């Protein structure tokens, strides 16, 4: 029972060897490249031999018995909500590239996966969602509007509200004429032939969308997989009360500035906007 | 690991009269006339789950 300090005088059982981070500056010659993650420190602490010293001297422990004490550390980080390190800044998502007229009467539609990038800093779950969509817009303002695709058929859009609370089982349209303004839970709205990649993104968990079997690599979720979750179109309100036969059946096609909701046909009530929240507890659970 | 986070919304009852305007459609408050089938008055101190 004696811990040798080489000099001074050995102390008996129950001793303390501190390993602080305030000693890195003094060791100027070892941590001259690494920042607080894998730095070297002097667990000597004599108090008169200047900053760094006693590199050759070792804190002895007897050969007859082995020691083994506690380790009550004190960690403290400052890692942002989004950064290149944790892989939360980038997230892929196949969006429309162009859409012109070629072949005479044909209409070719091209789609290509594009890796997006978010800025370092901004926190809060709502603010991150708005930024994920802000990246979808900046992509359109550099490739989209210059080639062909309109502001209407913009693929990929993250939301939070339930697009089926005002839906009536008879008419088939959202009677309020406006989707209920009240968020419930984040998801991923998609248009024909477009999805979102999350194999190299932890932003999937943030939205609250995990796989029942996370051990399988590949979090691909295209539009073809969201069968049975069509967003019910709105009801023509300015026509329903005006006429008062009744309009009812007639859904809202255009609006202010004129932007078509992309209806599947002239007869049906649903649109080409597949929702994730609606495909969960509203579709077929089998 | 599910807890209870005690809050405090003095805006209650008064936010109800404003939320009907923040949202575009009175879904919950479909009967703003009837004094029984109306929207339940928002109670003070809202408790919400927090995975700790």
């Amino acid at each position: 029972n004696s811990i040798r300090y080489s000099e001074l005088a050995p102390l008996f059982d129950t001793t303390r060897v501190y390993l602080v981070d305030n000693k890195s500056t003094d060791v100027a010659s070892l941590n001259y490249q690494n920042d607080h993650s894998n730095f070297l420190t002097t667990v000597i602490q004599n108090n008169d031999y200047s900053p760094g010293e006693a590199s050759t001297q070792t804190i002895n422990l007897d050969d007859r018995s082995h020691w083994g004490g506690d380790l009550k550390t004190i960690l403290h980080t400052n890692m942002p909500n989004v950064n290149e390190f944790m892989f939360t800044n980038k997230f892929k998502a196949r969006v429309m590239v162009s859409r012109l007229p070629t072949k005479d009467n044909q209409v070719e539609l091209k789609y290509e996966w594009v890796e997006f990038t978010l800025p370092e800093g901004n926190y809060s779950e709502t603010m991150t969602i708005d930024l994920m969509n802000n990246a979808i817009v900046e992509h359109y303002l550099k490739v989209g509007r210059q080639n062909g695709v309109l502001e209407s058929d913009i693929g990929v859009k993250f939301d939070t509200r339930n697009f089926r609370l005002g839906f009536d089982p008879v008419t088939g349209l959202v009677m309020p004429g406006v989707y209920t303004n009240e968020a419930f839970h984040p998801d991923i709205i998609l248009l024909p032939g477009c999805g979102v990649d999350f194999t190299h993104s932890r932003l999937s968990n943030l939205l609250g969308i995990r796989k029942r079997q996370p051990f399988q690599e590949g979090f691909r979720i295209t539009y073809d997989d969201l069968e049975g979750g069509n967003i019910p179109a709105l009801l023509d309100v300015d026509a329903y009360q005006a006429s008062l036969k009744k309009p009812v059946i007639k859904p809202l096609t255009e609006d202010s500035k004129k932007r078509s909701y992309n209806l599947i046909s002239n007869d049906s009530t649903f649109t080409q906007y597949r929702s994730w929240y609606l495909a969960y507890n509203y579709g077929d659970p089998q | 690991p599910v807890h209870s986070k005690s809050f405090y919304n003095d805006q209650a009852v008064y936010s109800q009269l404003i939320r009907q305007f923040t949202s575009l459609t009175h879904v919950f408050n479909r009967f703003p006339e009837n004094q029984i089938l109306a929207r339940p008055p928002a109670p003070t101190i809202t408790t919400v789950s927090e995975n700790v």
């Binding site: 005002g166 009536d168 009677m175 309020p176 004429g177 309100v237 329903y240 009360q241 008062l244 036969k245 009744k246 | 459609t25 009175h26 479909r30 009967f31 703003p32």
Partner: peptide, 13 residues
Amino acid sequence: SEDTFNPVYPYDT
């Protein structure tokens, strides 16, 4: 006017 069908949702005004 039809006659029997109240959306049951104060759409007005």
